[PDB]
Amino acid sequence: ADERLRINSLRVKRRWRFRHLADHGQLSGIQRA
């Protein structure tokens, strides 16, 4: 990563990674609007 970084220098919702858990109240804070 750093090697490529240096040489270059020289040159769905993922916040939870859902409907199942959210509908069964298993995700804190999530609710239907």
């Binding site: 916040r15 858990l21 069964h24 298993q26 804190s28 804070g29 999530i30």
Partner: protein, 126 residues
């Protein structure tokens, strides 16, 4: 049967539909991840998934209802509701076993809070 001839106990969590989650039901897990500005919501979700599967496979036919997973600081409290069918010695064995596995698997002081009930607390019938 016949074609026009066509034309189960449930607890509170089972009875009430998902659109009651902040009106009648609550949230099973309680943590700060989903609040505004806080991070690691996904990691907490994955931890919750593993806890629920582990507990349902480690207390088979004992859990009367769904778990309640609380988090304060780095503490991790599993409040479970179980039946009075298994012997208390086996319950103590499993409590110790699960506490130690989860503490060494999540690198935090996990603790467990069994509440036994004589039988499923049925809310209504659907």
């Amino acid at each position: 049967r016949e074609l026009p001839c066509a034309w189960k106990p449930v607890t509170y969590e089972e009875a009430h539909a998902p659109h009651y989650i902040a009106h009648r039901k609550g949230w099973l897990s309680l943590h700060t991840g989903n609040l505004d500005g806080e991070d690691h919501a996904a990691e907490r979700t994955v931890e919750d998934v593993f806890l629920r599967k582990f507990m349902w496979g480690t207390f088979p036919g004992c859990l009367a209802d769904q778990l309640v997973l609380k988090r304060r600081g780095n503490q991790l409290e599993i409040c479970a509701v179980v039946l009075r069918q298994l012997s208390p010695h086996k319950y103590y064995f499993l409590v110790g076993y699960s506490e130690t596995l989860l503490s060494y698997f999540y690198k935090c002081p996990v603790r467990l809070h069994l509440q036994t009930v004589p039988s499923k607390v049925v809310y209504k019938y659907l």
